């Protein structure tokens, strides 16, 4: 609403004594529309250079819009959905042509879909979109000659190794480490507010996916800038480990290693890591050597990256989420809030307007018989016009959203796949890190109470 | 709140045309404590007559308020435990006695449990209260002289068996038919209601797990008693399924036989059945002999009693359910009314009175240094003291609930497990099939919208 | 080899108290060749009747040689292979052209295949071969113009449907029961040998998957005609059960039927089955109405038809199996004992021109250093030549076997994944039932030891 | 038998271009009596110090023959069992104490078990034996005073996590590297054989689940004691991975660090691989890098150690094994030949003794009619005579075995389910790597035909 954090579980920040932060999209910004388009361009150009795809690819042309976060495809159709908190399918396209309620009927030979099967993909990362916009039209030019490329799920195969070589390549970390400009976004809020934290005895750390020669360079640009003399990034966090591999991380016991900050090199850890760099590691033996509880510790990620259910039950520690998109979701509904209105108040005439034509409708069959013929006939299209006005009312409130997706929390009246994962994953989120710390490091984050339907409310 | 049925999805009354009930507990009410009471009886008797347990258990005493609806048990370690919406222990039991957080927290090793694991039991059925009971009950003993009784997981089975032997066996039928007033509470609303639908073209069939010689007996005794002269309550429905073996009746595809009313003696189907009494069937070969869509056949039940995944993905038709405990619910709520004031207004006094507490806490050292000392250590107290009221008035609150469960939908703030389970299965519930039939067969029933954390409320 | 009754596993049959014949196939023999072009007719018909699939299937010829039993189809890739023993891929087809190892291998990234993965079909059913040889053909329309045809995964589910709903549509049964001699084969032999059989306190019984009104018009034809005066096939079976649904009869829990020889009616049963006809049931209430053990019950069926792991687990009695192809593979082998004998003998002329070629080819740099150049250029040519020879009689061989998938218990050197099921399902199996009953009811089965590769003969 | 390398599939070892050795158990040979025993010590020791066990345990006294290697616990009911090649249980004990046949079947409901339950633990480690030795005392003490020691499955978890812990902790390494001739044993055949495949263009490389440091000084005292002057043990691998994670090695995806032999530092790779040290890794990348096809790797090891399925289908490269009991196994059956020979003889005698009691016992009904009433009486005590004997004689047999878990290779008749992993899992065994290294570096392995049960064989 007019809020930064969002609740979903409550946590008091007095509690936490370590912060833990993922560099990438957490703590430095980046330029989504740009980040993704780049993604998109090194993996459409890896696939016809070690897979040899039809050389049409290279010229499709990319754009942002084609698609939302949260989406799930199934790389067995080629398909690409909207699922709703349940599973359900709000719509579906299969490549880039949207397929109807009654086709889709008898594709999944019900309305809902079952995640557990692998065939599907509802794991949300931080390619998701440029991927989703890339399958589209790789699946497209599928259709048109099948015999050239391989099958719907061989493409899917394919693309997810591409945006995963192409990450652990190096390819993609060059082309950004020499642009620092045109792909990151810098705010001195954030080195403000991490000094702010640390002046509460609140230590902050960062786990990142890249090397550290690297994570030296975006760190540098994106913090130093706004220190002060004498003072180093290195000095605000009090652990940062390198090459994590995230996801595993957590559940996972990869060993962890200790780094040099000078020379890079490394060297096997033989006891209770202290105070430094370090690359892997897992978060059971970093909990354990900081002498600490799980619920004591506190990590913001950009996205869920892995399984819900094994993240939250093998690893233990309170985790909050930042999701980008949220800026664009809060403006557009609030540019919508007068439309909304419009069609709140068009639906209780169309109500009552209804209510009405029950009570006239079931005394013509229940008391008298036959009498409001003609009286019945005259609500009807009294009815017909308020509910075909409310249909051009819910049309202009959509061109406040993406057209082909609507929005990202929403799967049509309730909430969206995607609104489940955080609601079960987050315990907190907000559109960016910046405003959480904005807030008192010793404030108590409390929710507000569901109410179910049942439920009477005061 | 103040309504007869609960909304949980969008359902158009106009549009379905065929209703089904379930026989027992849902079209024919019963009293829960009595019912209840037989079944841990019958269940407890046969164990030490086929399974020769110990003499000790004849002489348990049988306690309706030692559980609750919605619980779920591990037969591996033999403990009974309140989930949340996500699967969070909200507090568990071993037998009769307690765990604490420190004990679940060790054993569990997480504060979650994973439902998919066999080794716990989450499905709703119509004995899980007395199945709890005994099963508490069941663990101490075996917690005595081990050597005696089965394992944990060997009693649960055991339990199992019986519950449902005595089902099919015919020992519980046979006692309740001989005592038709002690176990089955009639109400002529009911019948009004189905003449009520039925005068609006719409056609009822009902579908039990029951023989149909036992059904007639029921059926008769509830329903004939409303009807007028020259009326027979088999002409209330188009249907009537026996033996249905309800949960694979919905997504297997178990053949149906047509039953002889008269004598009871059955013939193999060999075409489109037809109005009139069969025995087994599934949903599919019924929804496609009517010649009707699954979305305009609504089936009312007392108890998922399954795998919510597969019935809603494998069946395809409109599910409501009437829970009974929903009465207490309510009851209590309204009950705790008063009191839940009284805790929001101590809240909202401790919430200002924290909101300040940091206002002269950070500018402690914010601005100044060491200055409001005494004056922190002032508010320190007198938030200590409020928050004890809030303690004391959350505990008064407690006594107009189940005091070893609390209430059934609720797993402290949040939802609990079967709050969610009755979410995604019905689009509709209630107290009992009475309310809904209290309403116009043509009503169009319309959910409250959820609103998300971060939406604008107008 | 020489003998009739192959044995896996140890099996006295003077234990042996009860024993089940599975009706169709197993007891009543069947003109494989003609029923399978019956089903595959019947389902390539129906599926351009309800699915309305291009009308060119309508000319499909069919080959009974196109398919051999026990191969395994994946519906995704719309592939059929021959698996080995351990799930190794022998040879695998893409429709009908045969794939290369290359293929093969960037295919399935691996010469292995997960037969747990749902999306292969690996199910041991009396239509397989139909099944194959329709699917294949399926798919090569398919690929001419996939716009018409469903998915590859579509068009196997729909076969399916098709070979399932003309089994239980009556299409099948009908056409066959009015042509009992084109269809079914008959011998005495059969009716002696259950004779035999029953003067040895022997009680056989038979389960079904057919409408007894159907069952008691083949048994007649079938046996009746071998019988004395005054003697009624009836008299043969203590116990004959309809529509068991066999798969689940084993391991399910499904109800018995009591079923009335003159009518066909039925009621249901309300205490221990005795003697006589009944429909449906479950392996489980059977043998203990029986007061007998499981291993005193052995079951003789025609398909493994299910999964082996839950058949064995779940079921416990003991279970033989008669695998009609028998007769051609023992057949052919005898057909290719000589040509065996001769790639032998011309292999270890090749064995020991190959260990002289080392013992000369080491010692040329192990003691010496170049001095047998030409001598091993030598052997080198005389081993190109006998094994040019060894692959031309390898070829030879193959002759004598199905063209296209070889020999059905072998998969190359080692035995097919059909030779396991067998090997883990039957403890006893032969080519027809008739060879079991021509033996003494009071024989004991044992079994040849196997002999690991690290054992020694005596 | 009388051979060193037993084939189970083809393998041409000209084809091979590469050699993996596990450096522990394979290449370097320890004295299993004592390193189980240490293991034993240090495991029972940790338990009582970071578990607090009961006392007791401190004096539990090791007996190397309670475990035969390839036995099956389920840590749910605290047994231990050896299972056959499909999963049935020849011999089970819970705890110390056997079971019997009858109890068995009441507790597993069938005399086989489903090893996809995670609740047993069937994966073959270099531990087994002292972990089933003690798991065995560890659930003796808890049937004595099960208040204090956790359950069953908690227990066994709890082994597992010690077991782990020493051999990542270092307290095992330390004790060993201290006392290199107690539990290591060198042989210069190994490196006689090692030197004989250099000098044929094969490169060796080794994967330790060790540190370098450590690797370095086993490696040196287990070889450079027989190079010649002016060599180094170093020359005899191309590769050597540390700390290589073994299991996941093969199949997952785990990054590689080269290691600076002097220091021992490390950095990440940023390229192919080339000679040298280094940590982790995994199968995909090594392969690669080397620009070799994984049919041309051969990895030899000690253990499986992991899943076969997913070892075998998600590796692709050759896999052999050396299994150090077959020593023992060979020794014991050579030494029974002579009994085996005296039961073979007392069964044929036994058989046409049979064979001859029932021709003349179904003589006694089949022409006549009660006439040798005495007659089959003389047969039937002459025949419990031999049977007498044989049964002494197969009491005789398994004195020369492990008197508790008989061989290891058979579970009765049939081979045991160690005896299958190898069989699927390894192409080529043998008791040690030395024996492999005996024979041509470009010898071709060729395997024995099966020979199935209708097999005729010339």
Chains 1, 2, 3, 4 share one sequence.
């Not at 699946?139 to 015999?147: E, G, M, S, W």
């Not at 506190?298 to 985790?319: E, P, Q, V």
Request: aromatic share 12%; glycine share 6%; with cysteine.
């Amino acid at each position: 609403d007019t809020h930064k954090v969002f609740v979903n579980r409550i946590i008091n920040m007095r509690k936490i004594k370590l912060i833990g932060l993922d560099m990438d999209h957490t703590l430095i910004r980046y330029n989504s529309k740009n980040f993704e388009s780049l993604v998109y361009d090194l993996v459409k150009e890896r696939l016809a250079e070690s897979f040899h795809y039809p050389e049409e690819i290279k010229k499709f042309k990319f754009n942002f819009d084609d698609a939302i976060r949260g989406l799930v495809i199934d790389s067995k159709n080629g398909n690409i959905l909207k699922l709703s908190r349940y599973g359900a399918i709000r719509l579906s396209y299969h490549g880039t042509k949207q397929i109807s309620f009654s086709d889709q009927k008898k594709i999944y030979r019900s309305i809902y879909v079952d995640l557990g099967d692998p065939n599907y993909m509802a794991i949300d990362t931080s390619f998701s979109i440029a991927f989703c916009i890339l399958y589209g039209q790789l699946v497209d030019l599928k259709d048109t000659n099948p015999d050239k490329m391989p099958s719907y799920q061989a493409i899917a195969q394919d693309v997810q190794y591409c945006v995963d070589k192409v990450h652990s390549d190096g390819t993609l970390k060059n082309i950004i480490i020499k642009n620092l400009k045109k792909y990151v976004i810098r705010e001195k809020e954030v080195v403000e507010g991490l000094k702010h934290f640390i002046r509460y005895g609140k230590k902050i750390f960062i786990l990142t996916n890249s090397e550290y020669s690297y994570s030296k360079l975006l760190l540098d640009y994106a913090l130093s800038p706004f220190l002060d003399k004498g003072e180093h990034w290195q000095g605000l966090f009090e652990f940062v480990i390198t090459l994590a591999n995230k996801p595993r991380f957590f559940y996972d016991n990869l060993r962890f290693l200790s780094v040099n900050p000078e020379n890079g090199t490394m060297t096997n850890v033989h006891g209770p890591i202290v105070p430094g760099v370090y690359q892997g590691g897992n978060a059971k033996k970093f909990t354990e050597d900081l002498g600490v509880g799980g619920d004591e510790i506190l990590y913001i990620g950009d996205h869920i990256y892995g399984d819900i259910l094994r993240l939250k039950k093998d690893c233990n520690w309170r985790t909050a989420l930042v999701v980008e998109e949220l800026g664009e979701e809060i403006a557009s509904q609030i540019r919508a809030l007068p439309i909304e209105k419009k069609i709140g108040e068009a639906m209780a005439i169309k109500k009552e307007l209804e209510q009405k034509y029950v009570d006239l409708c079931t005394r013509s069959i229940d008391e008298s018989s036959q009498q409001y013929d003609q009286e019945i006939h005259d609500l009807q299209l009294q009815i017909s016009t308020v509910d075909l006005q409310i249909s051009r009312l819910l049309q202009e409130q959509n061109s406040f959203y993406n057209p082909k997706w609507e929005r990202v929390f929403r799967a049509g009246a309730e909430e969206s796949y995607f609104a489940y994962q955080v609601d079960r994953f987050a315990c907190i989120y907000m559109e960016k890190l910046s405003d959480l710390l904005e807030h008192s490091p010793m404030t108590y984050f409390r929710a507000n109470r569901r109410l179910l339907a049942h439920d009477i409310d005061i």
